[PDB]
Amino acid sequence: YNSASFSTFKCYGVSPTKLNDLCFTNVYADSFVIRGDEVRQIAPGQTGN
Amino acid sequence: RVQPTESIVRFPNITNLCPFGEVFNATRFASVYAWNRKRISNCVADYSVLYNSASFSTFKCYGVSPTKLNDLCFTNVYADSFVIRGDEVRQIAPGQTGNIADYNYKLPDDFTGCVIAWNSNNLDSKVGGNYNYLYRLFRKSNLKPFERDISTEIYQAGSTPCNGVKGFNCYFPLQSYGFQPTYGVGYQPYRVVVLSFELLHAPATVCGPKKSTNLVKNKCVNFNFNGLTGTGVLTESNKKFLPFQQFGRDIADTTDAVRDPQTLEILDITPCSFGGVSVITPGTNTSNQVAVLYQG
Amino acid sequence: PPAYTNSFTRGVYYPDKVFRSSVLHSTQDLFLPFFSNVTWFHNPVLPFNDGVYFASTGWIFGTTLDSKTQSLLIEFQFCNDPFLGVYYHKNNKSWMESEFRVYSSANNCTFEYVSQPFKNLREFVFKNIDGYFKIYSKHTPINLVRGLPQGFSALEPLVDLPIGINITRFQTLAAYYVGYLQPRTFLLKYNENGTITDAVDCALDPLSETKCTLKSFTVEKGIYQTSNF
Amino acid sequence: TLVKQLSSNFGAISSVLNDILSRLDPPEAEVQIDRLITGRLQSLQTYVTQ
Numbered sequence A: 001y002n003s004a005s006f007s008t009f010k011c012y013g014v015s016p017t018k019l020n021d022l023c024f025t026n027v028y029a030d031s032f033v034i035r036g037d038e039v040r041q042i043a044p045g046q047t048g049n
Numbered sequence B: 001r002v003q004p005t006e007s008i009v010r011f012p013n014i015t016n017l018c019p020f021g022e023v024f025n026a027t028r029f030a031s032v033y034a035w036n037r038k039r040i041s042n043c044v045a046d047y048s049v050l051y052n053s054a055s056f057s058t059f060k061c062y063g064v065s066p067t068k069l070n071d072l073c074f075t076n077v078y079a080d081s082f083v084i085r086g087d088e089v090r091q092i093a094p095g096q097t098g099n100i101a102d103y104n105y106k107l108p109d110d111f112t113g114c115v116i117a118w119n120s121n122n123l124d125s126k127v128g129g130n131y132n133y134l135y136r137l138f139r140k141s142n143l144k145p146f147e148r149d150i151s152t153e154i155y156q157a158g159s160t161p162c163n164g165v166k167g168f169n170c171y172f173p174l175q176s177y178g179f180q181p182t183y184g185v186g187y188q189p190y191r192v193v194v195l196s197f198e199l200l201h202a203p204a205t206v207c208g209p210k211k212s213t214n215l216v217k218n219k220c221v222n223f224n225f226n227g228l229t230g231t232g233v234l235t236e237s238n239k240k241f242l243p244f245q246q247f248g249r250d251i252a253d254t255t256d257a258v259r260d261p262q263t264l265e266i267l268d269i270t271p272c273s274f275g276g277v278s279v280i281t282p283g284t285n286t287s288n289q290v291a292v293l294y295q296g
Numbered sequence C: 001p002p003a004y005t006n007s008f009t010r011g012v013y014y015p016d017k018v019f020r021s022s023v024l025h026s027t028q029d030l031f032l033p034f035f036s037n038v039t040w041f042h043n044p045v046l047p048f049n050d051g052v053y054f055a056s057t058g059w060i061f062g063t064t065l066d067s068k069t070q071s072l073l074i075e076f077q078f079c080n081d082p083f084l085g086v087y088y089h090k091n092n093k094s095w096m097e098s099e100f101r102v103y104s105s106a107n108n109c110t111f112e113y114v115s116q117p118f119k120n121l122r123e124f125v126f127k128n129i130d131g132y133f134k135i136y137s138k139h140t141p142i143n144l145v146r147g148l149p150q151g152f153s154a155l156e157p158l159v160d161l162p163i164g165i166n167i168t169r170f171q172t173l174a175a176y177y178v179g180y181l182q183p184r185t186f187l188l189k190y191n192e193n194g195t196i197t198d199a200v201d202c203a204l205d206p207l208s209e210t211k212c213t214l215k216s217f218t219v220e221k222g223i224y225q226t227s228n229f
Numbered sequence D: 001t002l003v004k005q006l007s008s009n010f011g012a013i014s015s016v017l018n019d020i021l022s023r024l025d026p027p028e029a030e031v032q033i034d035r036l037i038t039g040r041l042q043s044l045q046t047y048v049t050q
């Protein structure tokens, strides 16, 4: 959260200020590299190519 | 016990009518971030006359029956007028959490009043959106009951400095409603008003137009002095109040001396004759006549 | 150069609107603790805590005092040395208010009220709770020089003005005494005339808290239990 | 002590029946009426046992 090295650090649906205080079950991570004009496409309620 | 013979009512003589035109449909409404507060005193508060100037779509109260508004006189009523989204009407409730209910105007748990709101179609709707109305979204700490915020500082998230130092994770807490008529009914502007008031905490100020009757003494009847109802004889009071007294209590902590609102006199209160009834008999087999005994 | 003088059982005022006669009722409210040092001055800015007790033989309430926030007087740009001037004219033997430099200007005003135009001792109590500014006073004649008189005298309320704003500092407009109010619970004795003749502390002295527990002004010889530790 | 027991709200709106009767409708009245009744009944039981 305080890395100060990520261009984009956004949490949707939950409060980003309190996440190391909640217990979950499973964490699934997907990572890929996209163009500069495709970052805004990757978002909830967003469409495109 | 002896039953009352009649009933009496005494209310201060006030002819002023409470102005609700600005409270109700008017030319301007305040924002939720800076909620406006108006003082209402020395006038008459009626509810049935509230159904002709503006339409009503939400008529609910918490702590007071909405059908007795003309029965009990009030003291220092507060009206808060502001506009929020249509999907936030449930957020204005005692003890109910919500974004507006946490980071904006909240409501104390012991609230006693009514919450009234109505939908606005185009009065507060613009084609390009209404950016005049701002709603807080970020706050360092939750507001205490009946608190206002006016600071325009940029909210601080993480360790990155904010509050004038624009940078990473620096967000302005105030966002715009952007009301548009093309939007859904759940996002249309809603003009919500909150009616908070106190009862029997001071001399009465705003009362219903039910007129008083002539004072009757020496007979215990149902009396209603400034919203205080009871049963007892009315007799002259030799004991004298100070100029700043209107009620009287005893060791039993019961009202016994009340200043008359009209004649500015003092009347002592005492309940009707009370006691117990007992009967004696010499025996059913011997005879049938009985005797009756009273106690007090 | 402030001076410190011990209080002597002063500052009792009627807590509510109710009339009680010959009762030993107890209540909790913002009162003045007994035997507390009070600053003695003979025009400094004095911070306004939860309560203030003024008693002397013109008041200014505000926060910034620079016409930026409304300030009680009894948006004004106060001067560096704000004061009132009464001039004894030579043409006629009278005292006129020739000099007036209290403030500079008043742009925005919210509530304004003017009352009727207007050796001894004056007591004043100021407190702001729930947006109400209540003033308690009693003009008690005395003939002393130094040392507040021993005894008791109630303070009847004067008037309530609904304003409800921030008050943190206040400045007066010559010997006066300032004391600070604290949350305390006393036992207010009443008489046949419904006046507070006497009162007793409940946190000062273990004997006093014993009286508080027993709800009487006479304590019989013996052992008693008061509270828990 | 029995007499002083009256002024307790027992968790209801107020300790006086007259205020409750006028301010609230019959459907919501009982919520405070039973709360008062239980406390007063308990006080009477304590007094009679003593």
Ligand SMILES: *[C@@H]1O[C@H](CO)[C@@H](O)[C@H](O)[C@H]1NC(C)=O
Pocket: C004, C005, C006, C035, C036, C037, C038
């Ligand atoms: C009050 O405080 C002053 C110094 O701050 C001290 O000289 C004086 O003795 C105190 N009074 C009491 C109650 O002892």
Ligand SMILES: *[C@@H]1O[C@H](CO)[C@@H](O)[C@H](O)[C@H]1NC(C)=O
Pocket: C068, C107, C108
């Ligand atoms: C005084 O009132 C006017 C009119 O409402 C307003 O424009 C002005 O900003 C106020 N003064 C200050 C210092 O805010």
Ligand SMILES: *[C@@H]1O[C@H](CO)[C@@H](O)[C@H](O)[C@H]1NC(C)=O
Pocket: C063, C166, C167, C168
């Ligand atoms: C009053 O002002 C002080 C500073 O002048 C501030 O700390 C306090 O929060 C303010 N309180 C209210 C109720 O405005």
Ligand SMILES: *[C@@H]1O[C@H](CO)[C@@H](O)[C@H](O)[C@H]1NC(C)=O
Pocket: C191, C192, C193
């Ligand atoms: C109570 O008031 C009466 C009426 O003036 C007065 O005669 C009497 O002396 C008072 N009682 C006192 C002062 O103890």
